[PDB]
Write a protein that binds this ligand. Sequence first.
Ligand code: HEM
Lengths: 416, 104
Amino acid sequence: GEIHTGHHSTIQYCDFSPQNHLAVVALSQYCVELWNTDSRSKVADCRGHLSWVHGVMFSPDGSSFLTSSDDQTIRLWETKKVCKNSAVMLKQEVDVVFQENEVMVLAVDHIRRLQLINGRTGQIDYLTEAQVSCCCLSPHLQYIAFGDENGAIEILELVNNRIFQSRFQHKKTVWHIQFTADEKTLISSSDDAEIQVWNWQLDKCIFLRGHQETVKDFRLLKNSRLLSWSFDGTVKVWNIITGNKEKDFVCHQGTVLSCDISHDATKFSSTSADKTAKIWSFDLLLPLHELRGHNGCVRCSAFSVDSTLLATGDDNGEIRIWNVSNGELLHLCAPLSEEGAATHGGWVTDLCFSPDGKMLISAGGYIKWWNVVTGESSQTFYTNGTNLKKIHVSPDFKTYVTVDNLGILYILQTLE
Amino acid sequence: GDVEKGKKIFVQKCAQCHTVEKGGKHKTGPNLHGLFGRKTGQAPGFTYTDANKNKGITWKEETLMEYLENPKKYIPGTKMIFAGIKKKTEREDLIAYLKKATNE
Ligand code: HEM
């Protein structure tokens, strides 16, 4: 016999089943597929272990199997369930754009490209492409866009599928993608030192010649300015559309680890990168203050929802709130104290402040609504997937849904 | 550290997935030549996880000492399988060996 495995790589784990000639094989990255031996065809996908499996084995009856995993988790499973198909559990990284009463979550098709499923409905919206690398909707709707493995970036029109612009650029797959306040002008970056600004239709190709090894990421500023940072840790302040490095900052000799901008006026912005939590008002070429309250060095930070708070996230998920006024020894939010290494939690991915500003939605191993300054508010929850890496909030702030670890997407809608 | 013991530890615990010599091939893990003073996720020609690719730290003794104690905790979602070296002495030895060999 000779049963070829899915695609190509190198097997990390495998397990033959004497019944039904089944083969529960964890190829790589917890790819625990259910194949069928001799017949040499897959039976069904099996999503649901976090940490990339560590091991699996069938019952002596063969009617079931254990699934040891790196999380520290063993999931029992019936034999019958695996064979049946279950094209679900959205892809791990997605972008969601919120336009009011209904929220739409970006998705990657279980087989190829994508499907847009709006919440509170069964309205799937499938589209075709040779496996999109990443996606972004246009400002004021009316368009849709996606990247490519070559770094090419198409922007399909909604009104007509025939109309599109394709941009060929970047040595590899395109990284960050963002649009101007104008419906026109794509902006992107990747392995190139330059930050691409490719206006579509016009097919313009303005470049941000930063002379970095690469630019790690960039974001829109309220002005025509375009904020950016690279692996040299420079916090550059360029310009949108037209490349022009108007204000330049060297907040970190190391890479800018997470940098957050506040979003009222352009009055403040800050970053922390395993060194110091610097903060500036852009008016100076150097930060207005350089927070140094953490010897273990703050990993990430996020601004208040148009207030004066400023979280500073630690590697262990610890948060230290800092007033947006140079800095003072504000009581640490201190969100996690007792726990250990037992589960999901690693990383301090994001902070979602409540509109009231009285609550911080910490999201690491799972969501917890720490009360700002001392203690916690609505800590509860506990996510199924764990490991959420993105935060989406409705203008109202009523609903945030997280998909973490590919567990699935979860939507929250508090009641009365 | 004791470079000789560090070598033993490397041979025992790292060599099955990584080379340290210049132009040594990528195995399951990336070649470690030039590791010190380099940012995470930069070996050209190795396909990292996004987690390892975006950890955003510089490899050096301090960062290695913490990583090697518990890789998953330092880079959650890494595809590197390694429990960690719990004894500090052994970590120092290994790190001292890597410091020598990955420059050589
Ligand atoms: C003490 C022994 C080991 C040392 C010193 C070591 C060293 C390293 C270092 C420093 C990195 C990250 C460097 C970078 O970011 O470019 C790394 C990543 C990696 N190592 Fe190891 N390693 C060891 C054991 C292992 C073992 C046992 C395996 C597999 C069995 C392995 C496979 C990998 C893989 C696959 C990655 C890539 C991580 C990712 O892309 O997510 N290593 N190793």
